Design a binder for this molecule. Structure first.
Ligand SMILES: [Zn+2]
Ligand SMILES: [Zn+2]
Ligand SMILES: [Zn+2]
Lengths: 64, 198, 281, 199, 198, 151, 159
RNA sequence: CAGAACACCUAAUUUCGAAUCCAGCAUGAGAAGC
C-alpha cells in the first residue's frame, strides 16, 4: 500500500474502507429532420457507432 | 396557503397490472386484435386512475375506525363536505386539497404492455370453453405520480401513505380478484413554498 | 458534471490557502487556481501556468490549459494523479500533441434525454473500435433510443394490420334475405330479449352494421350465427333458461331469421323497432 | 367491514409443474427454443393463476354436495349472484370478497424451470413419432399467495382450505392428467383489522 | 357425484431405466453417465405412467377389435369417440382419469446405481463400445394414484388390464433388453367429490 | 391520371440520399388523391351522420322532495322544460326517469338524502309531477318558481 | 410533380368514393410515392455500401380452390396460415425458407412438418397433397402483400 | 498461503425436438352543487 501510494494511485484497505463514471452514450448526428408514422418521432440514419473508452458515440458518415 | 406538500410516488408492479381502456375509439380500434386493452396515452404510456384508489382506500379504512367519514361509493351519493376525505379529495361545494396526478409509466407499450390469452374452463369436461385476449402491464414496470396538497395539515402524509399500503394490499386497476394490479409504492415527500416559480 | 461554454460546474451551482466553505472552495496560487471539493468530485481549475506553483494537497479532476513542458511538470508532483484531465483554452493540434503525452503517462483526457442503444458484431478498423450500422432514432418523451429495421418492420406490420382491419369493402354504401311480418318480429325480439340472446350490445352492433349497409349487417349476422366446425360454438350469448339442446339451436335460428328479416325493412322502420329494446341507438 | 381475512398460502411442488405462457410476445420468443413455455414474469419468476382453480374446485365440490351453486365454467355462463362461490370469488353484480393473488414463486426460473423432452411413442413399432420440448417447474419449488377476504363470514376459511385440498388432489395447472401440478399447501390465516394501516 | 381412487404400487423386478428428460439434469450428468435416470429435484425417480397405460390400452383394444383410435402415429389426432379417448383424453373433452406420475418412495442413493454396459464385437469377441448408464434397482417401490373424475363401470378392470400389459411387456426404456419388468399391486376405492367440504 | 397529395410535406426525415417520410395513406380515386387518416375519420363520421339523418298536495309533496333532494334544481329545470315544450314530452320525460332498469335496478331519480320507502317516495314523485302534468301552465310556473329561482 | 409507384388493385368502395388502405414513404426525389420494397432495397443497398467502406405460377382461382381443399383436410390450419403471414410479411426469402422448412422431409425420420390430412388417403396421395401445399404456398409468395392478405383472411380471419 | 486416501483397457455415439383448437360475451351511459 505504501509503495502503490508512492506511485500516486489510491488505496482502499478493507478495514479502513466517490466519483460517478457514467459510460455515456451520445448522439453526434443531426436530430431536427424527424417524422411520425405510428406516433413515434423517428428518423432513419446510417452511420457508425464508435465504442471509445468511457464513451459510446454514434457518429455520421462525415466522421468516418 | 403558503406551503404545498408534494408527494412524488414511484410505484413498481409486483404482479400483472390491468386497468381498462377508457376511450371509445381506442377501445373499438383495439377490440379486434385484443379484447381487453389496457389504458394508454396517445404518447403510448399506461394511465392508471389514482385519485379514486386513494379515496376508496381512505374511506374504507376510516369507516373501519368509526370516524364520521362519508361514502361516495353508492349510486349518486353525496360528499358531506365535513370529513377528512371530503377535505382532502373534495366535496361538491369545495375542491380537493390533494390534486392527484395520473400514474404515468416511464416506459411505452412495447416495453411493458403484453397481450395475453385468458380462458374459461368447463368444470366437468376440463376443456377450454372460452378464450379471450387481454392486454396487461408487466411486473417490474414502474410508474410515477405527483400528489400536490395545498393548505396542508399534519396528517395528510400519514393518510396518503396509509392509503398506499391499502392499495398495495388490495391492488390497483382491474381484475383485482384474479391477482392483478398488486404493486409497491415508494414516496418522496417535500415541503414547498408556493412561490418557487417567481 | 462540467458543462463547457467559461467553466460551469453543476453539483450548489458554482461556475469557475485559507478555506472558504460554501462545496469546499479554496484558491491556491498559480505563480489563481481554485480547488473545489464536493461529494462527487475534487475538481481543479488551474488557470494558466507561469515555475514552482502551489499544487493542492487528491485532485480527482484536473482542468488545465497549455499552448508544454510546464504543463506536464504540473501534471506530475500532484499526489494521487487525477482520473481525467481536461485540455481546454488552446489550439486543437497543440492540445492533441500535449494529449498524446498525457496518454503516455497513462492518464485519460477528454478534448472539448438519455440516449439508449437497443442494438447488437465489431470491427477494429483504424485507431478506434467500431460496428457499421444503419438504423432509426426514436425520440420518446424521456429517452432517445436507437433501433434497426427489425423494429421498423414490427411497427410497420402493426400499422398494416391496424389499417387493413379498419375499412370494409362496401360499408356506408349503396334482395334474398328472409321475410317475416312486423308482429312476429315484435314477438321474436321481445322473446329473445328477455332471455339473453339478443342483448343491448347485440342490438347496438346490429344498428351500426345496418347503418353501414345491408351487406355489412348480413356479414355481421352470419359471423355471429356461424357455428364453428371444431368447437360447435356460435357467437351468441347463451339463453338464460332450461332450453335443453335442440330449441337452443332453433332459438339461435330464430335470432338469425328475425335479424335477417328485419334487414330489408326501412332504416327508420328498424329504428322504431330497435329503440324499444336499446334506448341509445 | 371492520375485520378482514388474510390467508397466506405457501405451496410446495411435488410432481413437475407446468402452466402455459399466456403472453403472446413472451411465448413466441420462447417457441424458438421450447414448445411449451412456463408462465413466467418479467422479473423472472413463475406466475400461476390461482383464483379460477379455487373457484373450479369449490364449484365441483359444492355441486357434488348439493348446494345451489351456478356453473360459471360453461361457455359465457352468467353467475347468478346467490351462490357461495358468488359471495367468495365473485358475481356479475358484486365483485368477490376473496381477492386471490397469483402464486408467485419464491425463486427465479433459472433455479426452478427446466426444459424437458416429451415424446409420442408409436404404439406398434415402439419408436418416437413426435418429440416436443416443454418447460416445467421442479419439485420442492415454493410458491406464495395471499387470499384477502374483505367481509369474512365463518365458512370462508374452511371452504378455501377444502378447495386447496382439492387442488392437492387434481393439481393446480397445466397437464393435470399426465401427473403434472401435484402440490401441497400450508395455510397461515389471520383476521386483520381494516384500519391497520391508518396511524 | 363420485370419483375413483386407484392407488397403484410398483415393485421393480428387473432393472428399470427411464430416461432423464430435463436438459439441465442431463447435460450436467453427461460427464458421469451417458444415460441418466429421470429424477426429481427431491432426488426421487420419476416414471411417466399415462402414455404407457394409454399405449397398452390402444394395443390390447385394437387387437380385440373395437373402435379405438391410435394416438401414436405422426401427429395422430384423437377422435373423441372411444373408451381410450374418454379415459385419457382427446381434442375435445379432457381425460377423465388423471394419472399421476410414478415417484419412488426412496431417494436416488438407495435405488439408483451407476452401471457399465458394452458392445461386444461379434468376431473378435472383445469389448467394442463402453457406456455408463443409471438403473433403478430391483425391489424399488414406486407409488402413484389414478383418479377417475366421471367413473364408468368398466374403468377399474380396463386400468388393471393395462396394468397387466405393463407387467408383462414393461415400463420405461430399454424394454427389449430386459429392462423395466415390474409388478403392480392395486388398492381401489370410490370416494365422493364433496369429501374435503366439512 | 393526375395525382395530388394532401398531407404535410414539412416534418419529413432525410436519409440515404432521399428525403423520405414513412406515412399512412388512404388513396382515393376520383384525380388520384392521397389522404391521411383525418380525412378518413371525417368521411366515416359524415357518412354516419348522413345515415343518421333519418293543488296543495302537490305543493306539500314538492316541498318534501326538495329537501331530501329527490327532485332537484336540474330536475325542476328539465321537468319545467318538458312542460314548456308541451305535455307529450312531460309524460315521456317522467316515464324515462322513473324507468327502473330491469338489469341493474337503479332508477334515474336522485337518491333520498328502506327499499320500500325508496319505492314509495319515487312513486310519490311520479304521482306528484304526473298530477302536475295536467294542470294549467301558470300554476306549474308559480309552483316551480318557489323552489328553483331561475325556473 | 408527384408520381405514385403503386399498382391500384385492391381498391374498395367506401360510399361513392373508391378507397385504399395503404402504407408508404413520401420521397422528395418527382415527389415519388414509394412502397416498403423500396425501403428494403435501399436499406440493404446502404448496408452493402456501409460494410463495403470498412417461384412457380398458379392462377388465383386455383389458389383459392387448393387452399380451400387443404383447409378442409386440415393440412393448412390457421396456425400455418398465420405463421405464413408472418414469414411473408417479414419478406419473401423468409417465406421461401419457412415453406421449405415445413416441407423438408427429414432424411432420418421421413416426416414432413405439415399437419396430416383428415380422412383416408393413400400415402402417395397424402404426399401429393403435401407437394400441392408446397406449390400453392410457394406460388402465393409471388403475389403482393394485398392479395396474400385478401386470400388468407377468408380462412384465418386475424391473419 | 490450502484440502488430502493382483492388476490393467474402455466409458462414446445417433435421430428427432414438432402439430392443432379457440380468442367470445354481458351490464351500466347518470347525478348534484355553484
Ligand atoms: Zn364527507
Ligand atoms: Zn353464482
Ligand atoms: Zn378416440
Amino acid at each position: 500500500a505504501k509503495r502503490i501510494i508512492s506511485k500516486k494511485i489510491r488505496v482502499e484497505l478493507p478495514e479502513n474502507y466517490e466519483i460517478l463514471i457514467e459510460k455515456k452514450v451520445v448522439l453526434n448526428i443531426n436530430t431536427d429532420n424527424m417524422c411520425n408514422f405510428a406516433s413515434y418521432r423517428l428518423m432513419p440514419f446510417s452511420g457508425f457507432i464508435v465504442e471509445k473508452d468511457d464513451r459510446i458515440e454514434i457518429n455520421d458518415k462525415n466522421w468516418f | 396557503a403558503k406551503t404545498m406538500k408534494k408527494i412524488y410516488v414511484t410505484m413498481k408492479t409486483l404482479s400483472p397490472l390491468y386497468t381498462g381502456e377508457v376511450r371509445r375509439e381506442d377501445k373499438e380500434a383495439a377490440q379486434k386484435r385484443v379484447n381487453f386493452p389496457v389504458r394508454k396515452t396517445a404518447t403510448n404510456k399506461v394511465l392508471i386512475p389514482f385519485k379514486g384508489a386513494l379515496r376508496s382506500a381512505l374511506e374504507i379504512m376510516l369507516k373501519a375506525k368509526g370516524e364520521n367519514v362519508c361514502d361516495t361509493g353508492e349510486s349518486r351519493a353525496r360528499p358531506c363536505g365535513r370529513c377528512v376525505t371530503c377535505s382532502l379529495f373534495g366535496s361538491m361545494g369545495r375542491a380537493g386539497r390533494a390534486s392527484v396526478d395520473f400514474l404515468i409509466s416511464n416506459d411505452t407499450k412495447e416495453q411493458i404492455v403484453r397481450e395475453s390469452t385468458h380462458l374459461r374452463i368447463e368444470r366437468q369436461t376440463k376443456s377450454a370453453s372460452d378464450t379471450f385476449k387481454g392486454e396487461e402491464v408487466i411486473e417490474g414496470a414502474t410508474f410515477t405520480a405527483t400528489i400536490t396538497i395545498s393548505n396542508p395539515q399534519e396528517k395528510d402524509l400519514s393518510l396518503i401513505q396509509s392509503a398506499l399500503k391499502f392499495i398495495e394490499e388490495n391492488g390497483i386497476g382491474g381484475w383485482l380478484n384474479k391477482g392483478y394490479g398488486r404493486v409497491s409504492f415508494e414516496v418522496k415527500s417535500e415541503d414547498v413554498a408556493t412561490d418557487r416559480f417567481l | 458534471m462540467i458543462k463547457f461554454i467559461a467553466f460551469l460546474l453543476e453539483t450548489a451551482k458554482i461556475l469557475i490557502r485559507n478555506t472558504i466553505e460554501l462545496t469546499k472552495i479554496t484558491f491556491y496560487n498559480n505563480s489563481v487556481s481554485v480547488f473545489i471539493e464536493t461529494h462527487n468530485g475534487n475538481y481543479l481549475f488551474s488557470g494558466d501556468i507561469g515555475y514552482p506553483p502551489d499544487m493542492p494537497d487528491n485532485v480527482d479532476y484536473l482542468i488545465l490549459e497549455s499552448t508544454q513542458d510546464e504543463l506536464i511538470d504540473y501534471i506530475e508532483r500532484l499526489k494521487y494523479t487525477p482520473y481525467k484531465v481536461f485540455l481546454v483554452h488552446g489550439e486543437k493540434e497543440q492540445r492533441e500533441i500535449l494529449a498524446k503525452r498525457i496518454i503516455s503517462k497513462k492518464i485519460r483526457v477528454e478534448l472539448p434525454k438519455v440516449v439508449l442503444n437497443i442494438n447488437t458484431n465489431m470491427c477494429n478498423f483504424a485507431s478506434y473500435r467500431l460496428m457499421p450500422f444503419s438504423g432509426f432514432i426514436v425520440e420518446k418523451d424521456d429517452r432517445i433510443e436507437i433501433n434497426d429495421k427489425n423494429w421498423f418492420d414490427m411497427i410497420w406490420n402493426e400499422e398494416y394490420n391496424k389499417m387493413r382491419s379498419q375499412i370494409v369493402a362496401e360499408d356506408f354504401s349503396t334482395m334474398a334475405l328472409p321475410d317475416m311480418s312486423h308482429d312476429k318480429i315484435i314477438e321474436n325480439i321481445e322473446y329473445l330479449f328477455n332471455i339473453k340472446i339478443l342483448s343491448k350490445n347485440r342490438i347496438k352492433e346490429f344498428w351500426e352494421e345496418f347503418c353501414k349497409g345491408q351487406k355489412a349487417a348480413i356479414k355481421y349476422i352470419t359471423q355471429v350465427h356461424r357455428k364453428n366446425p371444431n368447437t360447435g360454438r356460435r357467437n351468441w350469448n347463451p339463453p338464460e333458461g332450461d332450453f335443453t339442446d335442440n330449441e337452443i339451436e332453433k332459438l339461435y335460428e330464430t335470432a338469425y331469421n328475425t335479424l335477417l328479416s328485419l334487414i330489408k325493412y326501412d332504416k327508420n322502420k328498424v329504428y322504431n323497432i330497435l329503440i324499444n329494446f336499446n334506448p341509445k341507438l
